[PDB]
Specification:
homodimer; alpha+beta; Archaeosine Trna-guanine Transglycosylase, Chain: A, domain 4; LON domain-like fold; 2 domains; five-stranded antiparallel β-sheet; three-stranded antiparallel β-sheet; 11 strands; PUA-like_sf (chain B); Lon N-terminal domain-containing protein (chain B)
Chain lengths: 200, 197
């Protein structure tokens, strides 16, 4: 499924929050199309290279990604677009090409959402930790335009909880892409093995 | 104490890495002057505002921040100013003033860099977990200009450990500001509490 690609320094996960700020011509033209078009673009983390790369070149795109849906947009100044996208359906991009203005694109086969699971008591620490984080945000009165996570607080869900943590944890891009694809349970387990002292 | 301020969505901590893209020309005069005489600018996290500039809203700065040092600027894209910075000394922001063009300026009382202290056995959890994140990024050989933290990895320094977690974790801007000025021991204890409970 040939779709436009917006590689980024961080990976996007389903239901994930993402406030973009486009200034490059390739993304300015691409984002505007999607605005009038209605379609959404694909977001995959950069396993290598930067996200601007005007003089650069060697940039490696992750093999997995999540589709990005545009919620609302604004134009604070000319040649600048401030977006507030939401992560949608995930995909497993394969052979992609780099078109005009350096706009990445690739045929990507979607990957159906995983069935919602309950968080076992063997992984309560993470879900309880996360829940603690969200509590403070709310307790402090953090406005919507700053909240790093959407309203639907699926705290009692393996996948969801792991997606939230993988989003904010400084993990290698190559790992983030794998986590996105791995099954919900396995995903929570692994991040769990990162937050807790596995090997002291 | 009077210094220029650059508000950001994320708080900046000592030794914290920062890749800043400056769009609004209202800041050009600030970054240029800094680049010129090698000075620094203050970075405070926004409590109730947008990094860019809303015409219907006003920005509210946090109670503290950290000075930023320009490791070096670049302009890969025509006229786009992109610079790598590092958080240096912390300051307590007594008062700030928003003047013309929306530029912020405040009274910054610099606070001395805390002394380093070994990580106690109970707070070891927080250090080993970070240590693993770091070793994870290295095992994958993630490029330096991609890593969120800088080379000097002080895994036995409460302040360092706590600061890293504080900039990574999704916490309200006002809390980051508070933890920033908080003494090393208390900082770690507090971030440790969030990681468990």
């Amino acid at each position: 499924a040939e779709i436009p690609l917006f590689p980024l320094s961080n990976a996007l996960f389903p239901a994930g929050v993402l406030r973009l700020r486009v200034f490059e011509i390739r993304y300015l033209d691409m984002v505007r199309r999607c605005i009038a078009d209605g379609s959404e673009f694909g977001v995959v983390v950069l396993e290598q290279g930067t996200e601007v790369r005007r003089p650069d070149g060697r940039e490696v795109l992750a093999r997995a990604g999540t589709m990005a849906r545009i919620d609302h947009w604004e134009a604070p100044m000319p040649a600048l677009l401030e977006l507030a996208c939401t992560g949608t359906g995930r995909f497993r991009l394969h052979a992609c090409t780099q078109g005009k203005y350096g706009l990445w694109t690739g045929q990507a086969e979607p990957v159906p959402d995983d069935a919602p699971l309950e968080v076992p008591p063997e992984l309560a620490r993470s879900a309880s930790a996360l829940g603690r984080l969200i509590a403070r945000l709310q307790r402090e009165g953090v406005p919507p335009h700053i909240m790093p996570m959407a309203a639907p607080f699926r705290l009692d869900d393996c996948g969801w909880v792991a997606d939230r943590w993988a989003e904010m944890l400084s993990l290698p891009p190559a790992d983030k892409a794998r986590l996105l694809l791995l099954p919900p349970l396995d995903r929570l387990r692994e991040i769990d093995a990162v937050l807790a002292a596995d090997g002291h």
